[PDB]
């Protein structure tokens, strides 16, 4: 198929992992959906920022956007909700996300990841 169809769901990824995974790629503005192992029922949205730690040669920080699954609806803590992570991701895929540091983030492209790592 020319294009895909929502392929960010890595099933059940580990926060710490995603960080490394996303970093492994380095792709700036890269999000991915992963089930919260620590939080059964909820989910985490790790997005790769274009903001390095040291700069050139350093890994780009990571932002974990927790997903509050309440009332059969998902929310990142905002008034807006959703039924499926798709209607959520595809939603914030444009509006983007806002960090606490005052910086904003955007889900340019999802994380496909591969089988082998190293």
UniProtKB/Swiss-Prot annotation:
Q: Where is the SH2 domain?
A: 8-111
What does UniProt note about where in the body, tissue by tissue, this protein is expressed?
Isoform 1 is expressed in hematopoietic cells. Isoform 2 is expressed in non-hematopoietic cells.
Q: Which domain of life is it from?
A: Eukaryota
Q: Where in the cell is it found?
A: Cytoplasm; Nucleus
Q: How is it modified after translation?
A: Phosphorylated on tyrosine residues. Binding of KITLG/SCF to KIT increases tyrosine phosphorylation. Ubiquitinated after phosphorylation by TAOK3. Ubiquitinated by a cooperation between ITCH and WWP2 via 'Lys-27'-mediated polyubiquitin chains resulting in the reduction of its association with LCK.
Q: What does this protein do?
A: Tyrosine phosphatase enzyme that plays important roles in controlling immune signaling pathways and fundamental physiological processes such as hematopoiesis. Dephosphorylates and negatively regulate several receptor tyrosine kinases (RTKs) such as EGFR, PDGFR and FGFR, thereby modulating their signaling activities.
Q: What is known of its domains?
A: The N-terminal SH2 domain functions as an auto-inhibitory domain, blocking the catalytic domain in the ligand-free close conformation.
Give the family from UniProt. Belongs to the protein-tyrosine phosphatase family. Non-receptor class 2 subfamily.
Q: What is this protein called?
A: Tyrosine-protein phosphatase non-receptor type 6
What species does this protein belong to? Homo sapiens (Human)
- What are the top taxonomic ranks of the organism? Eukaryota, Metazoa, Chordata, Craniata, Vertebrata
Please specify the portion of the entire protein covered by the chain, as first and last position out of its full length: 110 to 214 of 595
